[PDB]
Amino acid sequence: GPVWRKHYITYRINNYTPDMNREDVDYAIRKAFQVWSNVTPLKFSKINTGMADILVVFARGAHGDDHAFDGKGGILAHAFGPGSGIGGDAHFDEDEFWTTHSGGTNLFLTAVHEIGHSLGLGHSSDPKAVMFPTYAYVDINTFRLSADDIRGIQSLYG
Ligand SMILES: CCN1/C(=C/C/C=C\C=C2/N(CCCCC(=O)NCCCOCCOCCOCCCNC(=O)[C@H](CCC(=O)O)NC(=O)[C@H](CCC(=O)O)NC(=O)[C@H](Cc3cc(-c4ccc(-c5cccc(Cl)c5)cc4)no3)CP(=O)(O)c3ccc(Br)cc3)c3ccc4c(S(=O)(=O)O)cc(S(=O)(=O)O)cc4c3C2(C)C)C(C)(C)c2c1ccc1c(S(=O)(=O)O)cc(S(=O)(=O)O)cc21
Ligand SMILES: [Br-]
Ligand SMILES: [Ca+2]
Ligand SMILES: [Ca+2]
Ligand SMILES: [Ca+2]
Ligand SMILES: [Zn+2]
Ligand SMILES: [Zn+2]
Numbered sequence: 001g002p003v004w005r006k007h008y009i010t011y012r013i014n015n016y017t018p019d020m021n022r023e024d025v026d027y028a029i030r031k032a033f034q035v036w037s038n039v040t041p042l043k044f045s046k047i048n049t050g051m052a053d054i055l056v057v058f059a060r061g062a063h064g065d066d067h068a069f070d071g072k073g074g075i076l077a078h079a080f081g082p083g084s085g086i087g088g089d090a091h092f093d094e095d096e097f098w099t100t101h102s103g104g105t106n107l108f109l110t111a112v113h114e115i116g117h118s119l120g121l122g123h124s125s126d127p128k129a130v131m132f133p134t135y136a137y138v139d140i141n142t143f144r145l146s147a148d149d150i151r152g153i154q155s156l157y158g
Pocket of ligand 7: 117
């Protein structure tokens with residue numbers, strides 16, 4: 001499967017969910033990228049305006065890419081694997097209620113999962129792994145990437 005053929009990868013937050021304050025969204029996404037940068041040689045750089053590899057979008061229902069979202073619950077988000085254009089981009093279902101902690105869908109955790117997909121990872125069968133198909137919550141201070149996630153991502157980048 002595809003991998004980015006560079007280690008310096010940019011992202012841009014196309015739009016901001018009204019569920020959270022902007023600073024919280026920025027922080028959530030930043031920390032999510034940091035998860036993966038902590039165990040690879042990849043470096044991620046935030047762009048406010050202009051060209052970026054990984055676009056982050058909040059949208060609902062059908063939103064232009066042939067993979068419609070399905071309203072509150074069910075599918076929370078999705079992301080395309082490495083490549084130009086839509087490649088890498090990560091979309092979040094706005095019909096979820098995105099949150100800094102629990103009491104909705106935790107953005108940080110979901111973003112960790114999607115960025116995993118953005119980087120070219122598939123799913124784990126290990127429920128401890130962030131790349132497991134279904135969402136779970138833990139506090140960010142308690143969160144750890146599983147050995148399977150680390151094995152996965154290091155198999156692609158190192
Ligand atoms: C039999 C079976 N079935 C059924 C049943 C039913 C039953 C019952 C009912 C009831 N009850 C009784 C009791 C119960 C209790 C409770 O509550 N419980 C619950 C319920 C049960 O159910 C069962 C089921 O199973 C279980 C399991 O589950 C789990 C959960 C899950 N999750 C999920 O899903 C999420 C969502 C959430 C929300 O909501 O929000 N999601 C997710 O996750 C997703 C999924 C996907 C898939 O698919 O896989 N995912 C996603 O999105 C992705 C993204 C992401 C990821 C993430 C993450 C991950 C991970 C993580 C982690 C890891 C590790 C660690 C940590 Cl810390 C973390 C993180 C994160 N993020 O993000 C996506 P992606 O991958 O990117 C993608 C995309 C795209 C593509 Br192409 C690719 C890829 C009862 C009782 C009681 C009651 C009451 S009272 O008052 O009495 O209390 C009341 C009531 S009411 O409502 O009336 O008021 C009620 C009640 C009750 C009841 C009734 C509820 C049913 C459901 C019926 C069914 C069945 C079967 C089948 C079926 C069908 S079919 O077709 O299949 O056949 C269908 C149907 S329908 O309806 O839909 O049509 C149905 C059914
Ligand atoms: Br997709
Ligand atoms: Ca949904
Ligand atoms: Ca892209
Ligand atoms: Ca929302
Ligand atoms: Zn989409
Ligand atoms: Zn997934």
